C-alpha cells in the first residue's frame, strides 16, 4: 500500500500463447526463462475513489488484477511456507498503455500518475480459481481467472524474494491477461471479485486533475530510483530508463554479494541526481530548479542473469544490497556544471574505469524534462545517469571504490554467499 508494488508481466497463459511466435524471433530470441518483473512506483499508487488521470493522445487500458500483500519480511521464502508471509490480498488495477513490446521496460506505459489503483487488504487463505471482473460505467466488461496464471501467488513470492527482500506492506500484482478493456475520460472503472470489496476509480482528463500526490520527506535515500541504460557516448533515439527497488540500496563501506557460480559481476560508477521539488511538465530550461543536488551510486550488474524481457530486469538490477549509494547530497550550487565531472572506479586500488559527464548522451535537464513530461517526480526521487566504459569482473575480497569529482567517494566490498550468511 505504502509499500513497494512489484508486478509480474507475461504470467497469464493467454499472453504466453499469443506471443509464442514473437518470442522465437528478434529481439526476444527465446521465451522467458524466468519471471518478468516490473514496479509501479509511488506516483502511480492510489486508493479507491481516486481518479486515474488520462493522458490525451493515447489509448489506455484497464488491468484488473489482485495483489498479494506481504505480512512480514520476506527473504528467500520457500514456496510451501508462503501463506505465512502473506497478510492477505487486495484488488488492484495495472492501468497501462498498450503492451506492444516486452523488450525494453514499459515505463511510459505503466508508470504514469495514478496508474495503480489498489484496494483493501483482505485476509484470505489463497486466491486460487478466483474470477476477477471489470465493469465500466456499471456494465460487465471483462473477466479472467487466476487459474490461468503460470506462477501462483506462492510461487511469485518465492521467486521474487529469492533475490529481492520484500518488507511488510509491499505487494505483488499477480498478473494480467492478454485481452484488456479500454477506458476513456468520464468512465468509472470497477474491479470486483468474490470475497473482496469492489475497487472503483473514475477516469478523468489529466488537465482537470489538481495538485499531484505528495509524500513526507525522509532521509536520503528515499524515493523512486530511476536508472539510465547506455548514456555515455564514450567510444538510442530516446533514453532507456528502468526502476530499481529500494532494497537494492546499501550504504558506504558495506558488502555486496556475488552469487555462487556466475561468470561476470561488474560495478558501474554513476553520477546520481536527486530531486528537490515536485516536478511535472518541466522544461529543459527550468529543470535544474527542481534539483536538490548530487550523489554517487555503484550500479552493480550480474551479466549472467540478463534476459530480453523488460531488460535489464530485476534479477540483474534490484538485488539485495547490490546498489551502494552515498547518503550525502552535494547541493547543486556547490557544483557549477554536473556535465563536466570525472568519474572513476578502483578495485583494490587499481584504476579500472574513468570517464566524464561531458560524455553524457542525455543531459540532466533533458532527463528531468523527459521523465516529468509523463510522470510526477517528487522530492527524494533519484536518477542514476549511467556509466562510462571500462567495466570488469569483481570477486569476493575485492574492494571497489567509485568516485565522482566534487560529489563523493563510495566504498564497497564484495563477499561470497557463504560469507554473507
Residue 396, by phi and psi: left (phi above 0), alpha (psi -120 to 50) or beta? beta
Q: How far is the CB of 262 from Ca ion (least distance, A)?
A: 18
In whole angstroms, how far apart are CA 111 and each of 53, 80, 82, 252? Answer: 12, 32, 28, 30
Identify the residue whose cell numbers are 567517494: 409
The smaller minimum CB distance to Ca ion, of residues 268 and 320, is found at 268
Candidate ranges 124-132, 173-181, 298-306, 350-358; the one touching Ca ion (CB under 5 A): 298-306
Q: What is the DSSP letter of 55?
A: P
Candidate ranges 49-57, 121-129, 205-213, 260-268; the one touching Ca ion (CB under 5 A): 260-268
The smaller minimum CB distance to Ca ion, of residues 200 and 299, is found at 299
Q: How many residues bind Ca ion (CB under 5 A)?
A: 2
Note whether 112 and 280 are within 8 A (CB).
Answer: no
The smaller minimum CB distance to Ca ion, of residues 206 and 268, is found at 268
Q: Is 200 in the site for Ca ion (CB under 5 A)?
A: no
Residues 39-58 that bind Ca ion (CB under 5 A): none
Q: CA 162 to CA 284: how far, in whole Å?
A: 40
What backbone phi and psi angles, to 5 degrees, belong to 100? Answer: -85, -20
Please, what's the b/e burial string for 146-185 (b: 16 or more CB within 10 A of its CB; e: otherwise)? bebbbbbbbbbbbbbbebbbbeeebbbbbbbbeebeebeb
State whether residue 363 is helix, strand or coil: coil
The smaller minimum CB distance to Ca ion, of residues 113 and 268, is found at 268
Q: What is the DSSP letter of 216?
A: -
The smaller minimum CB distance to Ca ion, of residues 99 and 268, is found at 268
Identify the residue whose cell numbers are 506481504: 70
Q: How far is the CB of 319 from Ca ion (least distance, A)?
A: 13
Q: How far is the CB of 390 from Ca ion (least distance, A)?
A: 13
The smaller minimum CB distance to Ca ion, of residues 173 and 271, is found at 271
Note whether 69 and 222 are within 8 A (CB).
Answer: no
In the bound state, the residue with its beta carbon closest to Ca ion is: 299
Q: How far is the CB of 159 from Ca ion (least distance, A)?
A: 24
Q: How far is the CB of 384 from Ca ion (least distance, A)?
A: 6
**Terminus-to-terminus CA distance in the chain, angstroms?**
30
Answer for which of 99, 170, 268, 403 binds Ca ion (CB under 5 A) is: 268
Candidate ranges 62-70, 143-151, 164-172, 299-307; the one touching Ca ion (CB under 5 A): 299-307
In whole angstroms, how far apart are CA 415 and each of 182, 260, 322, 396, 399? Answer: 49, 10, 11, 4, 10
Q: Is 350 annotated as a binding residue?
A: no
Q: Is 299 annotated as a binding residue?
A: yes
Q: How far is the CB of 105 from Ca ion (least distance, A)?
A: 13
The smaller minimum CB distance to Ca ion, of residues 268 and 307, is found at 268
Tell me the three cell numbers of residue 55. Answer: 493522458
Q: How far is the CB of 402 from Ca ion (least distance, A)?
A: 11
Answer for which of 99, 206, 299, 307 binds Ca ion (CB under 5 A) is: 299
Note whether 396 and 284 are within 8 A (CB).
Answer: no
Residue positions forming the annotated binding site for a divalent metal cation: 268, 270, 299
> Which residues sit in the known binding site?
268, 270, 299
Give the footprint of Ca ion on this chain (CB under 5 A): 268, 299
Amino acid at each position: 500500500m505504502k509499500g513497494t508494488i512489484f508486478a509480474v508481466a507475461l504470467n497469464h497463459r493467454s499472453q504466453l500463447d499469443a506471443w509464442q511466435e514473437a518470442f522465437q524471433q528478434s529481439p526476444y530470441k527465446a521465451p522467458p526463462k524466468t519471471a518478468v518483473w516490473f514496479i509501479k512506483p509511488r506516483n502511480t499508487v492510489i486508493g479507491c475513489g481516486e481518479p486515474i488521470p488520462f493522458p490525451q493522445g493515447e489509448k489506455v487500458l484497464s488491468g484488473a488484477t489482485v495483489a498479494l500483500i506481504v505480512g512480514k519480511t520476506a527473504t528467500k521464502v520457500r514456496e510451501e511456507d508462503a501463506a505465512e508471509y502473506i497478510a492477505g490480498y487486495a484488488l488492484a488495477n495495472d492501468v497501462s498503455l498498450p503492451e506492444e513490446s516486452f523488450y525494453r521496460p514499459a515505463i511510459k506505459a505503466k508508470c504514469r500518475d495514478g496508474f495503480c489503483p489498489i484496494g483493501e487488504t483482505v485476509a484470505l487463505s489463497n486466491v486460487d480459481n478466483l474470477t476477477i471482473y471489470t465493469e465500466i460505467n456499471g456494465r460487465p466488461a471483462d473477466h479472467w481467472n487466476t487459474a490461468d496464471l503460470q506462477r501462483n501467488a506462492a510461487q511469485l513470492l518465492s521467486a521474487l524474494s529469492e533475490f529481492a527482500t520484500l518488507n511488510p506492506g509491499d505487494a505483488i500484482l499477480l498478473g494480467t491477461p492478454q485481452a484488456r478493456v479500454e477506458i476513456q475520460p468520464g468512465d468509472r472503472v470497477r474491479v470486483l471479485a468474490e470475497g473482496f470489496p469492489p475497487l472503483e476509480n473514475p477516469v478523468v482528463d489529466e488537465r482537470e486533475v489538481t495538485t499531484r500526490k505528495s509524500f513526507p520527506t525522509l532521509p536520503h535515500p528515499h524515493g523512486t530510483l530511476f536508472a539510465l541504460g547506455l548514456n555515455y557516448a564514450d567510444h538510442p533515439e530516446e533514453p532507456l530508463v528502468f526502476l530499481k527497488a529500494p532494497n537494492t540500496l546499501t550504504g558506504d563501506n558495506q558488502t555486496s554479494v556475488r552469487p555462487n557460480n556466475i561468470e561476470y559481476m561488474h560495478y558501474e560508477a554513476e553520477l546520481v541526481v536527486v530531486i528537490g521539488k515536485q516536478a511535472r511538465n518541466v522544461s529543459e530550461a527550468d529543470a535544474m530548479d527542481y534539483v536538490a543536488g548530487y550523489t554517487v551510486c555503484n550500479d552493480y550488474a550480474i551479466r549472467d542473469y540478463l534476459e530480453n524481457y523488460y531488460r535489464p530486469n530485476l534479477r540483474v538490477k534490484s538485488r539485495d544490497g547490490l546498489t551502494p549509494m552515498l547518503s550525502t547530497i552535494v547541493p547543486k550550487e556547490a557544483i557549477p556544471d554536473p556535465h563536466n565531472l570525472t568519474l572513476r572506479t578502483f578495485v583494490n586500488g587499481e584504476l579500472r574505469q574513468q570517464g566524464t559527464t561531458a560524455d553524457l548522451i542525455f543531459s540532466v535537464p533533458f532527463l528531468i524534462a523527459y521523465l516529468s513530461e509523463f510522470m510526477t517526480l517528487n522530492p527524494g526521487d533519484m536518477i542514476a545517469t549511467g556509466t562510462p566504459k571500462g567495466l570488469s569482473d569483481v570477486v569476493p575480497g575485492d574492494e571497489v571504490v567509485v568516485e565522482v569529482e566534487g560529489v563523493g567517494r563510495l566504498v564497497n566490498r564484495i563477499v561470497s554467499e557463504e560469507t554473507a550468511k
